[PDB]
A paper describes a structure:
The nucleosome remodelling and deacetylase (NuRD) complex is one of at least five corepressor complexes that recruits and activates class I histone deacetylase (HDACs) enzymes and directs their activity to chromatin. Metastasis-associated protein 1 (MTA1) (and its closely related homologues MTA2 and 3) are up-regulated in various cancer tissues. They serve as scaffold proteins for the assembly of the NuRD complex. RBBP4 and RBBP7 are WD40 domain proteins with a characteristic seven bladed β-propeller structure.
To understand the nature of the interface between the R1 domain from MTA1 and RBBP4 we co-expressed and purified a complex between MTA1-R1 (residues 464–546) and full-length RBBP4. The seven bladed beta-propeller fold of RBBP4 is largely unchanged by the binding of MTA1-R1. The first 10 residues of RBBP4 are unstructured, and similar to previous structures of RBBP4/7, the 14 carboxy-terminal residues are not observed. A notable difference in this structure is the stabilisation of a loop that supports binding of MTA1 (see below). The interaction region A of MTA1 takes the form of an extended strand followed by a short helix (H1). The extended strand positions a number of non-polar sidechains into a groove formed between the amino-terminal helix and adjacent strand of RBBP4 that forms part of the ‘linking’ blade of the WD40 domain. This region of MTA1 is held in place by a loop within RBBP4 that is an insert in blade one (residues 104–113) of the WD40 domain. The 5G-loop adopts an ordered structure on MTA1 binding such that several non-polar residues form an additional interface with MTA1. An important part of this interface is the 5G-loop that wraps over the top of the amino-terminal strand in the R1 domain. Interestingly this loop adopts a very different conformation in the structure of the MTA1-R2:RBBP4 complex.
Residue numbers in the entry:
A (entry chain A): 10 to 89, 103 to 411
B (entry chain B): 468 to 518, 529 to 546
Write the structure that this text describes.
Amino acid sequence: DAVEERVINEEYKIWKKNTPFLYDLVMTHALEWPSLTAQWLPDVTRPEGKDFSIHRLVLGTHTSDEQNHLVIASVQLPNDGEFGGFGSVSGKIEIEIKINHEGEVNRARYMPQNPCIIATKTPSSDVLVFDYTKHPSKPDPSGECNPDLRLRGHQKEGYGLSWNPNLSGHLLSASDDHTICLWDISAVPKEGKVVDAKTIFTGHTAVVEDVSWHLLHESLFGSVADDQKLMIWDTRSNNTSKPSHSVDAHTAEVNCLSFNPYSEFILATGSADKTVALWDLRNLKLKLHSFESHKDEIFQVQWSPHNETILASSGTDRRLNVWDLSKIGEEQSPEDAEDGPPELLFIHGGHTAKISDFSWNPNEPWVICSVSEDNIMQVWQMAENIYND
Amino acid sequence: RQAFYLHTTKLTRIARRLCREILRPWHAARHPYLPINSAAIKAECTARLPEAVRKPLEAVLRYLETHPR
């Protein structure tokens, strides 16, 4: 409604004026179409003589009446007596590559063993794989399908899509029938362009939302679904109708999970129940912690690639929260208690609409890129006096 | 909505530390939509211009498993 829009606009203006005191870096950019996915690629190029480096993002498009694109964008990031710091963004964020894509890009993830290969998740149960070096960087226009109706004929598809970082070409996805597909694209034939699943895991009784490989154990993966369950699977097991472990993770749909990159035992899940949960694989009958502060459903949760005790969460609400595990238990004044628990390190208020995805920059600490339904992409870094204190 | 860039100045960075008691970063960090008292900060910074180790994950897990929910 118009009244809520005005409130949101007022709150954005306040945030924007506050930015120098809350952030060290904020870069914003309006995409032509909203992206439902965001992931930093690992490469950074450092052009000689310049006081910035170049970083790149995989994005996509959500449009229904126009030709969708898998997108690669470049971002210029600064190298390390007046207040503020505002400047122009012109030319700091540019689109390098557009690749025609049939459906909307629900999720896009690069293959860790060769980051030129991007897998994408469509609203159908197929997953597309693209090598962006094998396409032109600017496509010709596309011939759009104009169905006078589209009769939908499948339950939801969750966005779950994870490459195994220890087995090259092994790819998990959340299918549209409560199961999980596994493909192996290493040594696919030369002639064969289509590839069938090596395995189907059945177990969940509702829409599977997310899947993720374990980062160390090559045969372990986790999954979460609308059945309120977290499930740990082992590819070595002969029984693909039952997982190794099954947890009642939450009191509503579980939309996401993420393994902690400094500990083989720790992971986090995020739910429609408005909480993030902390789990230890050595004792999954006990939930270690619950991060409550979010006003709405959690859809994404991601651990800091640089700090073992840091994670961030996002979802339906326009805010993205950053949590510091090391502050769990700390004393607070009663006033600060009202603001939330001490483990809530930072609330990012820059977006004015639902946050679809976000990604921690793997190369510059504390840099995040977040994308929202309003078309906005923000690349930002909170003030060092908040994260060093 | 207008696009922008912010690379916070060295002076603002030191002002944030100097005027810790006015800014209250711990509080501000959880209140994006409250106006920060920048005037007060700028004043006290210009006036006072003539002058962190983290717990291991292991330790946080030890704390948690000894303070159950």
